[PDB]
Design a binder for this molecule. Structure first.
Ligand SMILES: CNc1ccc(-c2nc3ccc(O)cc3s2)cc1
Ligand SMILES: CNc1ccc(-c2nc3ccc(O)cc3s2)cc1
Lengths: 61, 61, 61, 61, 61, 61
């Protein structure tokens, strides 16, 4: 009943240096799902299902 | 009843240096799921199922 | 009833230097699930099933 | 007598990512020479003395 | 007499990722020479004395 | 008389990832020479004396 947050950090990314020399990149998706190339990403959920880089499947019923 | 957080860190990424020299990258997905290339990612969930880089399957019923 | 966190760290990644010289990368997925290339990732869950890099299977019913 | 340069590179800097988090920087020079903080610098001389970051001395005669 | 350069590289820096978290930096020079903090520097001289980060002395005669 | 350079490299630095977490840095020079902190530096000289990070002395005559 006296919660005290201070200087806290949650789902935090900082201080990222990145060099990506690539002569070629290619995704050849044929009918499917694909997720590629996530970098320096931060989420924070409450009462929820939190996905960052999901390759979810073809739901059939 | 007197919770005290201070300078805490949770799901935190920091101080990442990355060099990626690649002459070729390729994902040739044919009908499937794929997740590739996650870097410096941070999540934090509460009352939820948290996935970062899932390759989930084709749900059939 | 007098919880005290201080300078704590949970699901934390820091101070990562990475060099990846690769002349070729390739994922040739045909109908399946794949997860590749996770680096410097941090999660924190509460009351939830937390997966980082799962290759989950084709749920059939 | 048939010099052929092609795609040559000389005194070349490229592809530099830099993060510098600093809570304090200070140079307290009292009567002297100082050089600090050179980053991503490129020179090319011909028939000359080329210095990049010199701390040269008090010439007296 | 048929010199052929091609795709040559000389005094070349490339693909540098750098993270520098520092709570304090300080140079307290009192009467002297100092050189500090050179990063990703490239030179190329011909018929000349080439110094990069010299701390040269007090020439007296 | 048929010199052929090709894809040569000389005085070359590439693919350097560096993380430097330092709570304090300090150079307290009193009357002297100092060189500190050289990183990813490349030189190339011809008919010349090439120094990179010299701490040269007080020339007296
Ligand atoms: C959003 N959903 C949620 C539910 C519950 C919580 C927490 N329950 C407790 C119990 C004891 C304790 O020392 C800390 C905590 S935090 C946090 C979030
Ligand atoms: C500007 N000052 C200068 C003087 C001389 C030169 C060179 N002399 C030679 C001799 C033979 C050889 O195979 C290459 C070279 S390059 C380059 C520059």
């Amino acid at each position: 009943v006296l919660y005290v947050g201070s200087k806290t950090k949650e789902g935090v990314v900082h201080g990222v240096a990145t060099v990506a020399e690539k002569t070629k990149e290619q995704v050849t998706n044929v009918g499917g799902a694909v997720v590629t190339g996530v970098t320096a990403v931060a989420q924070k959920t409450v009462e929820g299902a939190g996905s960052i880089a999901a390759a979810t499947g073809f739901v059939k019923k």
